[PDB]
């Protein structure tokens, strides 16, 4: 029958199926504890006492607002400023040898640390002048995108920024805000945030891009999904554009058309 709020094998498997067809995220049995913990909060928020009740309301109403909250609950958004640091110097030298507006796409922006790390690198290497560069960042998670839009972070989290970067691109909070920092609007102006599901058969993005950052997100997808997205990226890259993967990813594995050109960096042809 049940237990005081219990997740049954049957419900876990339905949840696994539902999240896979909406976000492409492959959940495993060793994550059944995170699932339960992340999801009972949604049950409580709504006043439901049953996962089957919860699951059924979702299935019966495909346009339910709860669908976005269900997705947000199951995504893992761990990120950090200047994560996989070696990528930024590479991005800088590449942009410096190119002309025209340099456009980058952060395909899994999370709370904004990645898209702002890219903006800082480019403002430092290219300068901040209208039409010099632009960053497009997206994510399926509307909650994290909202955090990213605000651009407020904990000062203790910026361990990787030089004092010159802080002085140049952030405002420091004082009084009730002490300990917080806020990306200046002048730099935020060069970053566009939107929601884009990588499972889409067609991306609603302003490309082509000189570079695409797709880090630490493919790891949640299965084999054919990974190859499909990789194939969707190809026509989105400018001639000598770059594709950056996370530390764990190997793209030349699914499509040889991508060649390794540095620490988890790839170029086409």
């Amino acid at each position: 029958m049940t237990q005081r709020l219990a997740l049954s094998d049957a419900h876990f498997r339905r949840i696994c199926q539902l999240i896979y067809q909406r976000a492409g995220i492959v959940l495993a049995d060793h994550k059944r504890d995170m699932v339960y913990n992340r999801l009972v909060r949604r049950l409580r928020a709504l006043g439901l006492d049953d996962f089957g009740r919860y699951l059924s309301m979702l299935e019966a109403n495909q346009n339910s607002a709860e669908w976005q909250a269900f997705i947000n609950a199951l995504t893992t958004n761990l990120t950090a400023f200047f994560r996989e640091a070696h990528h930024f110097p590479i991005l800088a030298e590449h942009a410096r040898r190119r002309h025209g507006e340099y456009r980058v796409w952060s395909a899994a922006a999370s709370t904004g640390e990645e898209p702002y790390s890219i903006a800082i690198t480019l403002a430092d290497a290219l300068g901040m002048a209208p039409g010099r560069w632009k960053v497009f960042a997206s994510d399926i998670d509307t909650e994290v995108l909202e955090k990213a839009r605000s651009g407020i972070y904990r000062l203790s989290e910026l361990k990787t920024l030089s004092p010159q970067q802080l002085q140049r691109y952030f405002m420091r909070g004082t009084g009730p805000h002490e300990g917080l920092v806020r990306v200046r609007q002048e730099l935020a102006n060069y970053v566009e945030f939107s929601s884009v599901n990588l499972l889409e058969k067609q991306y609603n993005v302003p490309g082509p891009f000189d570079a695409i950052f797709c880090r630490n997100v493919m790891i949640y997808f299965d084999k054919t999904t990974q190859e499909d997205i990789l194939r969707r990226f190809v026509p989105l890259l400018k001639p000598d554009g770059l594709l950056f993967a996370g530390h764990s990813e190997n793209f030349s594995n699914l499509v040889r058309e991508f060649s390794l050109r540095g620490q988890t960096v790839y170029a086409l042809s």
């Binding site: 802080l166 002085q167 405002m171 420091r172 805000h177």
Partner: peptide, 5 residues
């Protein structure tokens, strides 16, 4: 409030 570094 907020200020420069």
């Amino acid at each position: 409030n907020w200020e420069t570094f």
